[PDB]
Design a protein around this ligand. Structure first.
Ligand SMILES: [Mg+2]
Ligand SMILES: [Mg+2]
Ligand SMILES: [Mg+2]
Ligand SMILES: [Mg+2]
Ligand SMILES: [Mg+2]
Ligand SMILES: [Mg+2]
Ligand SMILES: [Mg+2]
Ligand SMILES: [Mg+2]
Ligand SMILES: [Mg+2]
Ligand SMILES: [Mg+2]
Ligand SMILES: [Mg+2]
Ligand SMILES: [Mg+2]
Ligand SMILES: [Mg+2]
Ligand SMILES: [Mg+2]
Ligand SMILES: [Mg+2]
Ligand SMILES: [Mg+2]
Ligand SMILES: [Mg+2]
Ligand SMILES: [Mg+2]
Ligand SMILES: [Mg+2]
Ligand SMILES: [Mg+2]
Ligand SMILES: [Mg+2]
Ligand SMILES: [Mg+2]
Ligand SMILES: [Mg+2]
Ligand SMILES: [Mg+2]
Ligand SMILES: [Mg+2]
Ligand SMILES: [Mg+2]
Ligand SMILES: [Mg+2]
Ligand SMILES: [Mg+2]
Ligand SMILES: [Mg+2]
Ligand SMILES: [Mg+2]
Ligand SMILES: [Zn+2]
Lengths: 77, 64, 194, 220
RNA sequence: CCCCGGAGGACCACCAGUGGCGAAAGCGGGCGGCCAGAACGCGCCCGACGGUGAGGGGCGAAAGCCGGGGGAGCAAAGGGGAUUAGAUACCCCUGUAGUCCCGGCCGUAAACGAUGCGGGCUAGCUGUCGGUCGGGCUUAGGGCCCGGCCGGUGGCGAAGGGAAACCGUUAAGCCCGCCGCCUGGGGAGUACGGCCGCAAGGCUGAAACUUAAAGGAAUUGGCGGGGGGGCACCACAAGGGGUGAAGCUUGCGGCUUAAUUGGAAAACCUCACCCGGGGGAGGUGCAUGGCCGUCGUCAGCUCGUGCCGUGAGGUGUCCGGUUAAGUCCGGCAACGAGCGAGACCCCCGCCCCUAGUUGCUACCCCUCCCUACGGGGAGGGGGGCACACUAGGGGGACUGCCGGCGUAAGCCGGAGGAAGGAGGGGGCCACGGCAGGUCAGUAUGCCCCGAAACCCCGGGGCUGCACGCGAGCUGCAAUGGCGGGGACAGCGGGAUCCGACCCCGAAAGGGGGAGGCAAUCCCGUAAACCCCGCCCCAGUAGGGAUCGAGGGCUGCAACUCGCCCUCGUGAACGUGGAAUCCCUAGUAACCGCGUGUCACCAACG
């Protein structure tokens, strides 16, 4: 489910799965990429953010995805 | 303006070296040339780049 | 692939077509792509995988330390280590360093209870050491098998050795050091003044 | 002594070797050459500041009403441009129920100036300047720790700090004299300024400066 | 304290050194005598006579013991003066053994290089000591300098070795001998036996039982009453206003209670509590999602390749300058790059353009009024978009110029400039934490209540009150109170709502009702402030708690338990202990207005 992302030419993505993924204690597993703005303008306004929770056996198990496609040339050049 | 960050000086050096003859030791001509020559969608960064190219032109004339 | 480093340029241009010529003329491999070009039949195995932590103010920051052994099963072996925040790139780094550190292994007979002239065992008695694990490899008669530990057996089989007798000293439970000492002995087969 | 040039609107009055400096232009007149009168009544022309250091920070520039908008505090040493009478007005906005009541402070100062002129026959501006000169402290003490006990030690006071201390002492003496008794604040300020000008030891400012200077002389 | 004399005991300042001698312990003034042991030089003598060494010996710091002498200084024990909760210690005064000498005993020490003794081989560079040889000089000296050998003594460091620190011709390397010692920890240097000792004690030295580690070197962090640097009005300095004391509003604690609810804009409802009657607002936020707060008025975190390491890990990311910044500039086994910083996004501020159903009034005319007679003021209408305003786009400021400083990042002063050093305010909140707060916002695991949780009803309670603590309001007065008079904003809200205007009423309030679904109508002529008159230092013409009588508003309902107005009544309080909070400019402080919650009600935001 990340080679699907490399199929696209995204310069930035960030995936966070928060919950009790292995045990009864939450862990907040997260992976990320490089040139992906985190605060300011693009993030929170022009970066594709999506939060969904999935009812598994023992919890909602939140998933937050931040993506920027190959043509999101924010003001830096 | 206190200190110019990395991207300011980097853009300054690349635009000064790609076109060494389109910049002299004045600010107005420098601002005009950088607006003509680079994709500079921000007045403040354009002004900082123009001033920094002005200072390179000053030091490059001073070195000889 | 772009043949970065001039040896890679010759290897992709086909002026060097076999891996034997590099080790015959003392050529230094700086890139793994030369190894995958010249040895398409390279098998890589994950010898060890340990979790490793650094203490900080907010808690331990864990990193996987994966040890990988690469070999052609015909007298070429190498072992590499990779530390990474996640296991996949840790294994990738270990595989790349193993491919960089691949070396030829001299083989033959030499056991007193054998007479075949095949590469099934080590040609003479060799030694290797990594920290405190000392491993002496001894030529054995054909059909005996690998008489080492498990990770040593994996490294020897990848290096293309059938029978050998081992003599170890020190804590062999340090899997990284045991693997490194066995690989060190296999590389020390080339330091013998024939 | 200087090598950093100087802002314009400043003036140098070199006598002997000493470069006396004034930050404000005394010589100012209307378009017809007439003088400008403080409150329309008092002139800024004959006033003489007897302290050479204090001459640099007393802005005796002619103004009808001493009302600068509160625009000289951004820069360090900006208080040298504020007129001295407006500084007196600004130091009357206390306690907290009188903050921002510049009209009340202006009326108090105008009445005090009239009372001063009719009781002394002198220029009210001149009497106020003499009160400041007699009230400004020339020494001070500063905290020092020898290992846990905060001792004292004599130091010098810069002329700006001397002017600030004298002005604060005059205004707080007037306020304390006026609190909780039938005497009005204008009369309290008038007698305080006249006592400060005469160097009478009864005044709050003269007592405060004498106490500070004796403490400094004790803890040199 | 100074001088002049005498007596006594210890030590041998500087020179003086990883300098010397010695087997170790140990040895530091000079002269002399008697001994000892090494190094160097040698075509001297003997001819393997050597190494190590169980057992066996001899020497062996300090303290201590036995007997004698001595005793200046210091000083266990002890006495006293302090400090402390205590102080039988640490500080001060004093003080005896002891420390010194002679004879003997003791026989121990971190008695250490924690490194047994003997011999051979294995890059070097460098300080110093002794002897000797070659050259040069000469404080003409037993002197100095350079070079070689031999022998010591330090430093760095080949090969090699090591768990690593590190050793490395003074080995902990490669070898050849002999001796001593070790075999997880505790029990335990304990018990018993023996020997030695005047004694203290010493040497030698277990097991039962108990235990799963004890331990070495190094890495990251955390911490420190170790060191250094940087920064911050949630720090200090310089200041301003305060809170802490009184009365009152309010929140938590406690007490009381049927209940005073559960957590960390209240009469019904809300509501979850109590009395009575007819799916979870039940737990676990240590199961969780999301959100949020704080670390974080931070600058940090990481990666690619390389490099050091067996490894955990380092480097880069460290040093010097620089500042908001891990911002840069210059040196480095680093060279680049990325998220955070910035940039970026709104709003304020100056200029330009476009625009004038609304908003502006210069220019006009008609009317009313006044007229010192010149003229003026007010209203309606016209004309216009000039001014102002409204809104969309653009420009402008960039250390740009100058002087100084600096390799250069960049800093200070000055001009000019609407605006000068990130122009001013705010947003966006890195990686990872705070077993941070929220199953009472929604959601969800599990575990329970199971025709019982229901946002059912009626009443009460959350409003109970000895008291503690936190945040506030209005005061103590005269820079004031009261009474008249004159003003001057900006947001913002308005639908059955805002409400002009009109009438009634002393007030609160009541009746009718234009216009406005918004630059058009309305809330809306704000208060502080200025002006004039009364009060005059007093618990008062300050203060407005408490209480009595009465009149209204909302609502189904006003007692518990609402809000407003009139008349009367006039408490504490005279500026508040220890302590403590916030704040750097249109800011603090004061003043009011709109609005959120809202049938009504704001001392709150
Ligand atoms: Mg009074
Ligand atoms: Mg011997
Ligand atoms: Mg013996
Ligand atoms: Mg002794
Ligand atoms: Mg004695
Ligand atoms: Mg004594
Ligand atoms: Mg020892
Ligand atoms: Mg060892
Ligand atoms: Mg060494
Ligand atoms: Mg023993
Ligand atoms: Mg015994
Ligand atoms: Mg540390
Ligand atoms: Mg302070
Ligand atoms: Mg109070
Ligand atoms: Mg009721
Ligand atoms: Mg370095
Ligand atoms: Mg309550
Ligand atoms: Mg009640
Ligand atoms: Mg009042
Ligand atoms: Mg108050
Ligand atoms: Mg009153
Ligand atoms: Mg108005
Ligand atoms: Mg109103
Ligand atoms: Mg009274
Ligand atoms: Mg009543
Ligand atoms: Mg009621
Ligand atoms: Mg009344
Ligand atoms: Mg009283
Ligand atoms: Mg107070
Ligand atoms: Mg409303
Ligand atoms: Zn064979």
């Amino acid at each position: 489910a990340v080679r699907q992302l490399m199929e696209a030419g995204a310069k930035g993505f960030e995936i966070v799965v928060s919950g009790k993924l292995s045990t009864e204690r939450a862990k907040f597993e997260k992976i990320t990429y490089g040139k992906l703005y985190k605060i300011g303008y693009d993030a929170k306004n022009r970066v594709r953010r999506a939060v969904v929770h999935v009812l598994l056996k023992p919890g909602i198990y939140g998933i937050e995805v931040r993506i920027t496609p190959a043509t999101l040339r924010y003001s830096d050049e | 303006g206190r200190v110019k960050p990395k991207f300011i000086k980097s853009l300054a050096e690349k635009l000064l070296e790609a076109y060494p003859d389109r910049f002299t030791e004045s600010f107005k001509e420098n601002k005009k040339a950088v607006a003509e020559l680079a994709d500079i969608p921000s007045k403040t960064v354009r002004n900082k780049v123009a001033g920094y190219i002005t200072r390179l032109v000053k030091r490059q004339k001073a070195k000889e | 692939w772009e043949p970065k480093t001039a040896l890679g340029r010759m290897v992709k241009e086909g002026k060097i077509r076999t891996i034997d010529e590099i080790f015959a003329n003392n050529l230094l491999i700086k890139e793994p792509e030369i190894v995958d070009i010249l040895l398409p039949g390279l098998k890589q195995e994950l010898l060890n995988l340990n979790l490793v932590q650094r203490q900080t103010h907010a808690g331990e920051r864990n990193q996987f330390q994966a040890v990988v052994a690469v070999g052609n099963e015909d007298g070429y072996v190498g072992v590499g280590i990779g530390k990474s925040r996640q296991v996949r790139q840790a294994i990738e780094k270990a595989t790349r360093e193993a491919k960089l550190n691949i070396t030829p292994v001299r083989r033959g007979c030499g056991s007193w209870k054998c007479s075949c002239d095949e590469p099934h065992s080590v040609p003479f008695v060799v030694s290797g050491k990594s920290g405190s694990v000392e491993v002496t490899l001894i030529p054995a008669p054909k059909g005996v098998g690998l008489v080492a530990g498990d990770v040593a057996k994996v490294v020897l089989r990848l290096a293309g050795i059938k029978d050998v007798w081992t003599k170890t000293r020190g804590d062999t439970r340090t899997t990284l050091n045991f693997a490194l000492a066995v690989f060190n002995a296999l590389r020390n087969t080339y330091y013998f003044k024939l | 002594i200087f090598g950093e040039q100087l802002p314009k609107t400043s003036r140098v009055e070199y006598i002997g070797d000493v470069p006396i400096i004034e930050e404000c232009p005394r010589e100012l007149k209307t378009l017809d050459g007439n003088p400008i009168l403080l409150f329309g009544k008092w002139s800024f022309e004959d006033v003489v500041v007897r302290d050479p250091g204090l001459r640099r920070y007393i802005c005796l520039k002619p103004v009808v009403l001493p009302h600068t908008e509160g625009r000289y505090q951004k820069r360090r040493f900006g208080k040298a441009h504020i007129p001295i009478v407006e500084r007196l007005v600004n130091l009357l906005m206390r306690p907290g129920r009188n903050t921002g009541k510049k009209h009340k402070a202006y009326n108090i100062v105008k009445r005090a100036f009239e009372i001063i002129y009719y009781k002394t026959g002198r220029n009210p501006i001149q009497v106020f300047i003499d009160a400041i000169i007699n009230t400004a402290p020339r020494e001070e003490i500063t905290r020092i720790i020898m290992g846990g006990i905060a001792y004292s030690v004599s130091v010098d006071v810069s002329p700006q700090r001397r002017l600030d201390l004298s002005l604060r002492w005059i205004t707080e003496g007037a306020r304390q004299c006026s609190f909780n008794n039938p005497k009005p604040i204008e009369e309290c300020l008038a007698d305080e300024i006249m006592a400060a000008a005469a160097n009478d030891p009864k005044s709050y400012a003269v007592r405060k400066r004498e106490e500070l200077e004796r403490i400094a002389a004790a803890s040199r």
